[PDB]
Design a protein around this ligand. Structure first.
Ligand SMILES: CS(=O)(=O)Nc1cccc2cccnc12
Ligand SMILES: [Mn+2]
Ligand SMILES: [Mn+2]
Ligand SMILES: [Mn+2]
Ligand code: NA
Length: 258
């Protein structure tokens, strides 16, 4: 449970994280390397935002952002040799620390000519984040929120990745609680005002199972189906929530009141 002043620090950090995604958007084009995208992000964070990437060095992570293409579910490592191409779907997952507090958000970019199925998976995944956000208010259990995401996603013939989840966030990067995106008999966390955490559903076109690669980081779908993710950092309010990482292109308001 964060203090008013700490919540303010989270607004600042969350805005910065959102702004990295706004900044990078025009660079997300056929032909660019994920390596360069990462350099551009890191330069912006250090030099213009006077912040730091939370990811760089975190538990040994080598880069400043995670960039995940098509069948890669999460933790794609920027690389100078990996070029974006027409029809790709790409997640850029950003976390910045500013004044001791973390802001954590990601979105999908569609590269070149969108494919109908890429467009669909991306839209449905964002909608699954959106429906979750509209549920958030004190007195609700996280279990219900995980359950609703799962129900929505699967009704689309998609699946929810189980190995990854949203999380409490503040002066730490991945704090309690775990925010599962599916119904779990383990989840029992009733929301309270001032809690800050993320919601970050990872949705596969095919089966839920994943595979980790040999670089200690990159995760793909076991069946090599497409996978998409969107993420926001939020604070629970008296009556709902406030999205700390909102972007210009978000089709949901910052403050959600009940
Ligand atoms: C820093 S990171 O964005 O690459 N993410 C992570 C790093 C290290 C450990 C993690 C565990 C769960 C989820 N994300 C993790
Ligand atoms: Mn991560
Ligand atoms: Mn993230
Ligand atoms: Mn996160
Ligand atoms: Na993907």
């Amino acid at each position: 449970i964060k203090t008013p002043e700490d919540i303010e620090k989270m607004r600042v950090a969350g805005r910065l994280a959102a702004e990295v995604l706004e900044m990078i958007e025009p660079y997300v084009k056929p032909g660019v390397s994920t390596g360069e995208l990462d350099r551009i992000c890191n330069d912006y964070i250090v030099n213009e935002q006077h912040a730091v990437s939370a990811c760089l060095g975190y538990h040994g992570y080598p880069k400043s952002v995670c960039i995940s293409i098509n069948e890669v579910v999460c933790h794609g490592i920027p690389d100078d040799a990996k070029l974006l191409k027409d029809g790709d779907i790409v997640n850029i997952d950003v976390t910045v620390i500013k004044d001791g507090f973390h802001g954590d958000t990601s979105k999908m970019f569609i590269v070149g000519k969108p494919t109908i199925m890429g467009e669909r998976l991306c839209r449905i995944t964002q909608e699954s984040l959106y429906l979750a956000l509209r549920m958030v208010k004190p007195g609700i259990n996280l279990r219900e929120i995980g359950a609703a995401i799962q129900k929505f996603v699967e009704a689309e013939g998609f699946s929810v990745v189980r190995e990854y989840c949203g999380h409490g966030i503040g002066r730490g990067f991945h704090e309690e609680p775990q925010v599962l995106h599916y119904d779990s008999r383990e989840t029992n966390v009733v929301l309270k005002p001032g809690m800050t955490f993320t919601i970050e559903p990872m949705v596969n076109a095919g089966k839920k199972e994943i595979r980790t690669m040999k670089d200690g980081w990159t995760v793909k779908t076991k069946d090599r189906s497409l996978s998409a993710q969107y993420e926001h950092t939020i604070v629970v309010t008296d009556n709902g929530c406030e999205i700390l990482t909102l972007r210009k292109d978000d089709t949901i308001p910052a403050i959600i009141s009940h």
